[PDB]
Structure 1
Amino acid sequence: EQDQQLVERVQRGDKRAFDLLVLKYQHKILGLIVRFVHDAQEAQDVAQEAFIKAYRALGNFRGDSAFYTWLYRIAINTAKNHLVARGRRPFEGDHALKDIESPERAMLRDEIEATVHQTIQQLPEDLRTALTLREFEGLSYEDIATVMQCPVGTVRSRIFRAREAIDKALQPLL
């Protein structure tokens, strides 16, 4: 459960935690939906419908599956029902996005990707190591603190500082 802490608050009735989960996953859900509908505005509408349907179904979210898996399945159901009701209009790789998305958005993504990787390349090693152990090895702060032989609070601050450096480079682009 990659979203354990926000999911815990959602299950205590917290709308703000759900909003953060929408922010985290909206691009993945939009990218899924656009493979079904092949229209930019229609994809946004149906992706929005999927999130509201998921919200309204939270009573049935028991925490047995990962939140994203539960959300993904609802988005698939939403897209399917949308298409079956709509009928014929009057999926692999990046074909759908490349055809539908704004060309300016692809140019911005190219810039953002180069900037993220350049910022990480230039980080001090303690920051890049803490971030990589967290993001790609999945280690908890405690286990990172053990591997790097530092206090757990230093792991927390190092990961924060690494994300802030990336974010400061991305802020003008966004």
Structure 2
Amino acid sequence: VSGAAAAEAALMRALYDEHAAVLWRYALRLTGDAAQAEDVVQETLLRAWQHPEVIGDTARPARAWLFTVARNMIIDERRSARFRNVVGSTDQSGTPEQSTPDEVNAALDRLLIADALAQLSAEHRAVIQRSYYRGWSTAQIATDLGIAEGTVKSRLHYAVRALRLTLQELGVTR
């Protein structure tokens, strides 16, 4: 009946009141983290509910079966995932903060490329800005500009050398 399903809930609440607080202390010594001990207790008593053989015999100590399930859970936590990560906390002192370099070298190159680009024809400039700045393919630029495939290859081939002319004339290091 409905009271038979409620007798199982009053049975779990019974072993909670006799073993949970003692099992929490045991897992607390093996881990040292109270929030982790609570997680081990919930998982240990969950396996007790899933095993009626352990909850059957009251004349046999179910406490010993709990300490063994909790012990095995704790050593499994102590493997690979904890191995690498558990070491450091950024909030904790002694860890170097991440840094990013300044864009000075990138800004100077961008300024010199923008000067050499202005001294190019509208055709060559509109082809290097679609191959290197937009990253399109050779056929994609040919489709957009309405020109031949080899026309884009030739314009790119000269425009690169045209830029190398202007940069070497200004002393840009190879």
TM-score (norm: length of structure 1)? 0.36
Q: Which has the higher helix share?
A: 1
Q: With the length of structure 2 as denominator, give the TM-score of the two structures.
A: 0.36
Quick one: higher RCO (CA 8 Å, sep 6+), 1 or 2? 1
